[PDB]
Amino acid sequence: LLTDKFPANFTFGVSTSAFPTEGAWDADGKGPSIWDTFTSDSSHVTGGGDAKQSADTYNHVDDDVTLLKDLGVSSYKFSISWPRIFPNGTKESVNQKGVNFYNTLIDKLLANQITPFVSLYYWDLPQDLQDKGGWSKDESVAWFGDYADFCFKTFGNRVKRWVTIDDPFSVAYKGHETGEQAPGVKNVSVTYKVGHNLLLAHAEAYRIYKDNYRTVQKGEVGISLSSEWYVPKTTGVSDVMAARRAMTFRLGWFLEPLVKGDYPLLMQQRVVAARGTANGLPQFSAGDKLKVKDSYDFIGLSHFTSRLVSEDAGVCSGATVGFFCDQGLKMETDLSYPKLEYRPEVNPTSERRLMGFGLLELLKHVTSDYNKPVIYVTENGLSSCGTLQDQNRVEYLREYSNNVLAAIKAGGDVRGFFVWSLLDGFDWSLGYTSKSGLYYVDMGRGERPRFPRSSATFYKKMIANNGLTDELVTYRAYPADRDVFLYDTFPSDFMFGVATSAYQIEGAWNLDGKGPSIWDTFAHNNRLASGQTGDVACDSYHLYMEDVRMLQHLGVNFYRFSIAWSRVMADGTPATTNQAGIDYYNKLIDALLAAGITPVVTLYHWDLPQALENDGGWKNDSVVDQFEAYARLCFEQFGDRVKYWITFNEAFVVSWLGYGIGIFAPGIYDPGTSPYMVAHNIIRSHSRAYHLYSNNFQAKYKGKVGITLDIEWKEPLTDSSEDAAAADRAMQFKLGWFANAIFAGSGDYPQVMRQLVDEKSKRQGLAKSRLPSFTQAEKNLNKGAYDFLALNHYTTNPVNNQPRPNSQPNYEQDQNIDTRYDPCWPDTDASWLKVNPWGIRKLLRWARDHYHNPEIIISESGRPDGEDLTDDGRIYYYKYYINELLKAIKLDGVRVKGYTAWSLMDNLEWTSGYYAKFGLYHVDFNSPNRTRTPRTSATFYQQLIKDRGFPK
Ligand SMILES: *[C@@H]1O[C@H](CO[C@@H]2O[C@@H](C)[C@@H](O)[C@@H](O)[C@@H]2O)[C@@H](O[C@@H]2O[C@H](CO)[C@@H](O[C@@H]3O[C@H](CO)[C@@H](O)[C@H](O)[C@@H]3O)[C@H](O)[C@H]2NC(C)=O)[C@H](O[C@@H]2O[C@@H](C)[C@@H](O)[C@@H](O)[C@@H]2O)[C@H]1NC(C)=O
Ligand SMILES: *[C@@H]1O[C@H](CO)[C@@H](O[C@@H]2O[C@H](CO)[C@@H](O[C@@H]3O[C@H](CO)[C@@H](O)[C@H](O)[C@@H]3O)[C@H](O)[C@H]2NC(C)=O)[C@H](O[C@@H]2O[C@@H](C)[C@@H](O)[C@@H](O)[C@@H]2O)[C@H]1NC(C)=O
Ligand SMILES: *[C@@H]1O[C@H](CO)[C@@H](O)[C@H](O[C@@H]2O[C@@H](C)[C@@H](O)[C@@H](O)[C@@H]2O)[C@H]1NC(C)=O
């Protein structure tokens, strides 16, 4: 990479085109384009969807010009929509409201010192003109002339850089031969006639400008052409001339008519050789050659890729005519150059390659063979799945703009570089499956908010320094080791397990004297899917012996399950101790130990006995004593054989879902106060349960007590310091809510929660703050009240700052945050779970740094899949999350002592019923015997334990 400065009056720009970004497809009298009609057929668009709104730039001029001021670009390339100016294509349809929109944009651009670089035709052909033949017709030269003449006299007093036609190759070939772009015509005999008329339309536009508008307006008029760079597959003369021939058919098809005055002679000969003399390229009239030759002030170039070309006379057969059968060559991807996908294993055959040298050679070729024209790179950029930490785009922007510097030093007269693109949009036939903006656009929000990707920060800094600096040479958007797969084994101490839950597997909700749960009541109130209940579930009350055999087949070291409070105490009181309940858990513990499997017992999970919810449940404050007496009964009966206790599972869910929005049991909706009241007692219940164990049981039993908290990793949406503070704030409010008082050291809530809920409570007119206050004695009982930390981790979220100065009392509104999902993270059967393996690694270091380097167990990890036995999604998930877990141990030193896979078998997924299959075993819930069937994932997990990591 060169650290030289760009020339003095070099233009750093950025590009959009009307249809991918404007939206408002029929607002204010705009007529339909061929792309409106084309995209109305889902089969034409990858991933479906339409551009009826897309990025909605028609309604964001003020916001988008502010983004242009933030980058510091000198100029802005955009497109005028023909059907928005002339709804039916003719000058009689002139729509003043469409004229007003572009005037607003041009005026606002110049008020902020940004040069307009205006394109007249970026494929937006009005549907009415297509209905009468489109570009195949000789009338299209006149249609375009009247339309160009209008924009010249209407905007030309301010617009000084014009592009007649953008990428005629795609308009002709992709739009009329293969049909992949609008208007979807598939006719090999139309393409050369369309390119012919595009060149004639551009010439008529250039002629109109030179004679009627140039003397007064003093602007420039050019055309923009697209070209890949073609490197020969071998050094043989055959392939070197096949590569040069592909450059001729793709770029010289239009460049040679405008420079030399005719189609390239090589191109003329090849088509007549493959099609017949009656079917050659169109002939230019003597007057046509006069109008076309030298009809440019600059040449625009859009470049993206380099491909390998080799001679292939039999690339087609049986006289199958066509644009690429006339050339007699094949194109391949150069897999020798870095792949630009989200992760190393994504799409091995990818064409997105880091080949900046191709742009250097393209520019030098255009300078050498076409008499050194003025060049603007009007479009150059990388297509992504959409991530905002776009190291791939940063590398692309860094390398490719650096090869522009090399062309200028090699004599290339390149005066501008325009990045494709400014925002995300509807990338033609790729639809929304392809993102390219320096700014991400959230297409799930009506206002379509814009957010800078890391490439926006890079481009801003490079323009500020007029080239690269040492900081920009080595700049990275994320650490270089993030996606590297680590082949290694786990430490000797490391345990593998799987987990279940009492209400989700056991059944027998009222057999043998068991009292009812708040989840028995939730289910019997038809609050679960299809009125499905956990009345039988997997019948683990009767079939626990099957569970042990499955655990033996997996080879797990430990098995984490939960005790049902209502099964050992009918009403949650020792007065209702159910010896039958004691015996059931004694049988499960003994069968696990006889099989050499370590039992791990969760005390609570989520099934409070209804008798205690009647007295106020977790809001009642004596629940601290009630939970302590329940913990005592468990420590006495089972403490002799159970050596790892977990007090609570996902106290966040019990607090916010159960007592906040009331979607889980007990179903109380009070999002302002009760979640904090319940979490307060949970912290106080866990602390008293821990001290009861260390004071009265740890000496003789030598066990460890922990707590399990669920948490998504919280990644900043943007590299800004306000978004980094927002991400940490989202961590504190969900994980720190409980972990801070137990693990951080102060025995108290995170300072951010106390500051924020107090201040908002005061504005809302509340006598006391909605977040309770610990007594100094209570804080001291919280301090160090643990032996290990346990984390449930499934997914992550990008977070951004979002002040809410008028928010109502609400645990989520108190946080001043907003959440999204990275578009690159794959989906699962659950709308809230996205696959992001490195989230568990960043989460583990966060817990390590904030909680005094504790012993950590991952108590839950997994995803839903389909019902068939081949769950490749589950395997992909475990393969890479466990590898990221291994990285947190070996590479990061985090004291991770165990890993728990959710779940052992299909079970009742709370409100989602049995429709969400989470298990390594399939469970037939229509069988009375509830047969369990191992999936592919069970073998993969069993094999991974044997290997103790990842070998080779
Ligand atoms: C292209 O649009 C022009 C503007 O018309 C407006 O947009 C079109 C898409 C349509 O929605 C119209 O309703 C809009 O007004 C067309 O010109 C217009 O043509 C119409 C007739 O088609 C004409 O209406 C007539 O006006 C006379 C009085 O002058 C009245 O007695 C009639 O009853 C009827 O109302 C408009 O006045 C006229 N406007 C302008 C500015 O020209 C254009 O149509 C073509 O050109 C006009 C001059 C006539 O010769 C039409 O026969 C002819 O088709 C549209 N062109 C095409 C190819 O569709
Ligand atoms: C938390 O939940 C406990 C357990 O239910 C509540 O204690 C109970 O309060 C009931 C009243 O709400 C008591 O019932 C009354 O008992 C007396 C006899 O003592 C009868 O004469 C009378 O008619 C009622 O039946 C119940 O005895 C009591 N149970 C226990 C074990 O204490 C508790 O309520 C609160 O605390 C108790 C100690 C009393 O002071 C109650 O008046 C008070 O409301 C619940 N606490 C909260 C904050 O909801
Ligand atoms: C492909 O384009 C050529 C050149 O413009 C047309 O002449 C072809 O049309 C042919 O002639 C018409 C009258 C009709 O018979 C059509 O079926 C013929 O192929 C055109 N071909 C197609 C299929 O549209």
mmCIF file of N, CA and C in Angstrom, residues 17 27 121 246 259 330 340 388 445 476 600 622 728 756 932 938:
data_model
loop_
_atom_site.group_PDB
_atom_site.id
_atom_site.type_symbol
_atom_site.label_atom_id
_atom_site.label_comp_id
_atom_site.label_asym_id
_atom_site.label_seq_id
_atom_site.Cartn_x
_atom_site.Cartn_y
_atom_site.Cartn_z
ATOM 1 N N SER A 17 -28.259 5.211 -7.027
ATOM 2 C CA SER A 17 -29.102 5.315 -8.207
ATOM 3 C C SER A 17 -30.560 5.287 -7.771
ATOM 4 N N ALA A 27 -45.546 7.983 -5.704
ATOM 5 C CA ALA A 27 -45.920 9.196 -4.999
ATOM 6 C C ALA A 27 -45.832 10.394 -5.933
ATOM 7 N N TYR A 121 -29.991 8.281 -17.015
ATOM 8 C CA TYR A 121 -30.604 6.967 -17.185
ATOM 9 C C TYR A 121 -29.808 5.913 -16.422
ATOM 10 N N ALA A 246 -12.248 -10.573 -24.379
ATOM 11 C CA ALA A 246 -13.364 -10.328 -23.472
ATOM 12 C C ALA A 246 -13.442 -8.858 -23.084
ATOM 13 N N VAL A 259 -14.549 6.641 -29.267
ATOM 14 C CA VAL A 259 -13.187 7.142 -29.392
ATOM 15 C C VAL A 259 -12.752 7.092 -30.850
ATOM 16 N N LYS A 330 -14.202 -18.858 -21.787
ATOM 17 C CA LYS A 330 -14.836 -19.149 -20.510
ATOM 18 C C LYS A 330 -14.271 -18.239 -19.431
ATOM 19 N N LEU A 340 -14.219 -12.538 0.325
ATOM 20 C CA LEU A 340 -14.872 -11.451 1.047
ATOM 21 C C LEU A 340 -16.301 -11.858 1.403
ATOM 22 N N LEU A 388 -22.307 -4.280 10.094
ATOM 23 C CA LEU A 388 -21.841 -2.912 10.274
ATOM 24 C C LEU A 388 -20.360 -2.828 10.630
ATOM 25 N N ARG A 445 -37.822 -0.810 9.976
ATOM 26 C CA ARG A 445 -38.364 0.347 10.672
ATOM 27 C C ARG A 445 -38.918 1.335 9.655
ATOM 28 N N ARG A 476 -8.487 -1.920 11.611
ATOM 29 C CA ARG A 476 -9.379 -3.068 11.570
ATOM 30 C C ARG A 476 -10.710 -2.707 12.219
ATOM 31 N N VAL A 600 -26.311 -32.245 38.563
ATOM 32 C CA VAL A 600 -26.309 -30.798 38.768
ATOM 33 C C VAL A 600 -27.763 -30.368 38.909
ATOM 34 N N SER A 622 -41.543 -12.353 52.127
ATOM 35 C CA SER A 622 -41.304 -13.551 52.920
ATOM 36 C C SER A 622 -40.894 -14.732 52.056
ATOM 37 N N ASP A 728 -22.755 -1.416 26.928
ATOM 38 C CA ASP A 728 -22.459 -1.755 28.318
ATOM 39 C C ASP A 728 -23.670 -1.533 29.211
ATOM 40 N N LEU A 756 -30.085 5.726 36.691
ATOM 41 C CA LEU A 756 -31.098 5.894 35.654
ATOM 42 C C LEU A 756 -32.518 5.676 36.173
ATOM 43 N N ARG A 932 -37.924 -41.845 22.704
ATOM 44 C CA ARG A 932 -36.831 -40.912 22.462
ATOM 45 C C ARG A 932 -35.931 -41.466 21.364
ATOM 46 N N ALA A 938 -26.742 -35.653 18.435
ATOM 47 C CA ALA A 938 -26.312 -36.502 19.540
ATOM 48 C C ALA A 938 -24.991 -37.188 19.224
#
